[model samples]
Target: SAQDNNTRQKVNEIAATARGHVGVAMMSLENGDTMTLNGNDHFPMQSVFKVPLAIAVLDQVDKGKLSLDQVIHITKKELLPFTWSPIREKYPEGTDLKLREVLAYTVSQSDNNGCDILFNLVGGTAYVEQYIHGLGVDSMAIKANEERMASAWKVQYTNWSSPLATLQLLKGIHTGKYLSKASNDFLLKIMKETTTGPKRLRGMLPADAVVAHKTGSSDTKDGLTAATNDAGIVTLPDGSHLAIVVFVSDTKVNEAIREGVIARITRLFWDAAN
Candidate 1:
C-alpha cells in the first residue's frame, strides 16, 4: 500500500517540476486503484473534447439515429482556412466521406475540420456536453468547437475538464458501460492508432506497450500556453488497463517541456502498475 502512496507522492513531485498547473487522473481497470493531482481544477481541453464528441456520435450509431456508413458531404467552402486539417490537405476541393471515415480522421489524426464536422453531426457543443453528463460525469464540460476555440484566446477554456472527470469517462468507455461493443471497439482502435502526441503519453513506455489516447494542445499567446494534454488507457503486460488523463495547462514552457511532463507522468504510472 505504501507503493501506492509513493506513486502519488512521486507523481506530485513530478508535477512540481512543471512549474505550472499539472492535473493528472488515473485508474486501474483491473483493480480500481486510482490517483489524482489537481484533478478537480478546470483545464482547457482543446482537442481532447473530440473524444467525447466521437462517443456521442457513436451513441447515435448504437441507437440507429445515424449510420456509420452514411455519407457526409464536405464542400470546398466548408473547409475553414487557418486551421490544422489533414483531410482538407488531402482533398483540397472537398469530397464525400463516411461518418466512420470522418470520425477516424477526427480522432486518430486530430483533424480540426473533421472535428467540427462531427460536432455538427451530433448537434453542437451543448448536445455533446449533455451526452457526457448523461453518462454521470459532472467535472467535465464541452462548450466550444475547434472553430470557435481557434478564433480567440480565452475561448479555449470554455471547453474544459478536470483531470479526474476525464478518467471517469475513460473508465466507462473501456469497461463497455456506455457504447455498444462494436462502437467501443472502433473508438478504442482509432485512439490506439492516434498519430499525434507520440512524445507525450506513449513517449517513455516500452515499444510493445499499448496506449489508446487523444491529445489536446493550444497555441501560446502572450507567452502563455493554455493547455497541453493526453488522456487514454494503457494496457499492461498482464492485460490490465490503466486509464489516465494528464492536463498541463497555463504554462510558459516550450512544447518539449510541456509534452515531456506528460510523458514522464505516464511512465511513472506505467512503472508503478507493473
Candidate 2:
C-alpha cells in the first residue's frame, strides 16, 4: 500500500509541469494494484477509439456473424481524403482486402480508412458503443467515425473516455473477459504491432519492452492540442502485465512536450514496477 501511494504521488508531481489536463491510469495486473491522476476526467479519445472498434469487430467474428477471411472490396468512394490512411496510399486506385488484413491495417497501422471500413462493417458507431458498453465498461463513448471527426474540429470531443475506464477495458481484454481466446490473442497481437506513437508510452521504456499499445492524436488549432493519447498493456520484466493510459488533452505545447509527458510518466511507472 505504501509503495502504491508513493508511486501515485510521483505521478502527480510529474504531471504538474504539463500545463494541460494530464489524465493517467495504471494497473499492475499481477497484483490488481492501481494508480491514477485525473483518472475520472473525460478527454477526447481521437484515434484511441480504434482499440474498442477493433475489439467489437473481433467480437463479431467470434460470434460467427463475421469472419476474418471475408473479402471486402474498397473502392475510391470508400477512401476519404484528408484522413491518415496508408491503405489509400498503397492502393491508390482500390483493392479488395480480407477482413483480417483490414483489421491489421486499422489497429497496427492506425489507418483511418481501414478504421472506418471496420466501423461500417461492424454496424457503425452505435454498435461499437453498445458492444463495448455491453462488456461493462461505461466511461468510454464512441460517437463519431474518422470521416466525421476529420470534417470538423470539435467533433473529436464527442468521442471520449476517462483514463481509468480505458485502463479497465485494457485489463478486461488482457484477461480474456470479453473476446474468445483466439480473438483476444489476435487483437493483442495487432495492438503490439502498432507502428505509431513510438515516442509516447513506449518512448522511455526499454527498447525490448513488449508494449501492445494504440495511439490517438488530434490536429492542433489555435495553439491547443485536443488530444495526444496512448493506452496499452505493457509486459514487465518479470512477466507481469501493466495497463497504462495517458491523455494529454487541451495542452498548449509543442508535440515534443506533449509526447514527453506521456513518455516520462510511463518511464516512472516502469521503474516503480521493477
Candidate 3:
C-alpha cells in the first residue's frame, strides 16, 4: 500500500509540471498495481485511434471475415494528395498489398492514407466504434476518419478517449484477452516499430527498453495543441510489463515541452516499477 502511495505522489508531481489537461494511466502487469492522473477525462486521440482500428481489422481476421493474405487496392483517390502518407510515397501508382502489409504501413508508418484505407475496408468509423463497444469498452468515440478530421480544425476532437479507457484496451491486448495470439503479437510488433513521436513515451526510456506504443499529435493551431498522445504496453527490465497512456491537450505548450512531459512521466513509471 505504501509502495504505491509514494509512486503516485511522485508521478503526479511530474505530471503537474505539464502545460494543460494532462491525463495518464499506468498499471503493473506483474501484480495488477495501477496509478492514474485525470484518467477519466475525455481527450482527442488523433492518430492514436489507429490502434483500435487495427484491432478491428484483426478482429475480422479472427472471425474469418477477412484474411491477412487478402489483397487490397489503394486507388489514387484513396491516397489523396496533401496528406501524410509513406504508403503513397512508396507506391505512388498504387499496387495491391496484402492486408497485413497494408496494416504495416498503417500502424508502423503512421500513414494517414493507409489509415483511411483500413477504415474503408473495415466498414468505416461506425464499425470500429461498434467493435470497441462490443468488447465492453467505454468512454471512447471514433467518429471521423483521418481525411475528414484533417479537413477541419475541430473535426479531430470528435474522435476521443479517456486515459483510463485506453489502458483498459491495451491491458486487454497485453493479457491476450482481446485479440487472438497472432493478432496480438502482430499489433505490438508493429507498434514497437512506429516511426512517429520519437520523444514521447520512448523518449526517456533506456535504449534497450521495449515499449510498443502509438503516438498521436496535432499542431499548435490557434493557441491549442488539439491533442498530443501516446499509449501502449511497455516491457520492464525484469520481464514483466506495464500499460500506460499519456494525453496532453488544449495548450500552446511548445512541442518539446509537451513531449518532454510525456517522457518525464514515462521515466517516473520506469523508476517506480523497476
Candidate 4:
C-alpha cells in the first residue's frame, strides 16, 4: 500500500511539472486494482476516438455484417484537408480498396480519407457514438468523424473522454470482455500500427516494449491545442504488466515540452514498477 501511494504521489508531481492538465489511469493487469490521477475530467479524444470506431467495425465484422475483403470505392467527396494521406490526390475517383486495408489506413496511418470511408461504411458517427454508449462508456463521446476537415475547424465540434473511461476500455479489451477475444485482438493489432502522435507514450518506452495506442491532435487559431494519448499493456522488467492510459492536453508549449512531459511520466512509472 505504501508503494501504491508513492505511485499516485509521483503521478501527481509529474502532472504538476507538465504545467497543463494531465489525466492518467494505470492498472495492474495481474491483479485488477487501479491508480488514477485527475482521471475524471472529460478531455477531447480527437483522433483517439478512432479506437472505439475501430472496435465497432471489428465487432460488425465478427458478426458477419461486414467482411474484411469487401471492397469500397474512394471518391473526392471523401477527401479531407491537412492530413498525411496521399490517397485523396493519388487515387482515381473510383479507386477501390478492401475494408481491411481501409481500416489499416485509418488506424495505422491516421489517414482522413481512410477514416471517412470507414466511418461511412460503419454507418456514420451516430452509430459509433451509440456503440460506445451501449458498451457503458458514458464519458466517451464520438461527437463527429475526424475525417470531416471542416468539422475539425468548427468551434462547436469536439470529441470527449476521460482518462478513467479510456483505461477501462483498454482493460476490457485486454481481458477479452469489451466485445470478444477476436474483436479485441483485431482492435489492438490495428492500434499497434498507429503511426501518429509518436511524441508521447511511445516516445519514452524501450525499443522492445509493446504498446498499442491511439492518438489525436487539434491545432486551431487559438494556439497549439495538443491532446496526445496512449493506452495499452506495458510489460515491466520484473515480468509484470500494467494497463496504462496517459492523456495530456492544453499545452501551449512546443512539441518537445509536451513530449518531455510524457517521457518523464513514463520513466517515473517504469522505475517505480521495477
What's the TM-score of every candidate structure?
Answer: 0.98, 0.97, 0.96, 0.89
Residue 178 lDDT (model 3) = 76
For model 3, give the 10-residue run with minimal summed lDDT. Answer: 10-19
Candidates' RMSD to native: 1.0, 1.1, 1.2, 2.3
lDDT of each: 0.90, 0.91, 0.87, 0.73
Worst 10 residues of 2 by lDDT: 9-18
**Per-residue lDDT over 90-167 for candidate 4, one digit per residue giving the tens place of the 0 to 100 score:** 673547888887887777777767776778888998998898889888887776765454454652135778888888
Q: Which segments of model 3 are wrong by more than 4 Å? A: 1-3
Candidate 1 residue-wise lDDT, 92-124, digit = tens? 999999999999999999999999988988899
Better of 1 and 3 by lDDT: 1
Which clashing pairs does model 2 show? none
lDDT of 4 at 95: 74
How accurate locally is residue 143 in candidate 4, as Cα lDDT from 0 to 100?
Answer: 62
Candidate 2, 1-274: lDDT as tens digits? 7887787787787677678999999999889988888899999999889989988998899999999999999999999876899999999788999999999999999899999999999899999999888888889899999999888899999999999989988998999988999999999999998768999998999988999999999988999999999999999999998999999999888899889889999998999986
- In every candidate, how many clashes are there? 0, 0, 0, 0
**Cα deviation of 194, candidate 2, in Å:** 1.9
How far does residue 24 in candidate 1 sit from its true spot (Å)? 0.6
Estimate candidate 4's alpha-carbon lDDT, on a 0 to 1 scale.
Answer: 0.73
Q: Please, what are the lDDT tens digits per residue for candidate 3 over residues 14-90?
A: 66666689899998877997888998999999888999999999999999999999999778778878889988898
lDDT of 4 at 158: 58
Candidate numbers, best lDDT first, in rank order: 2, 1, 3, 4
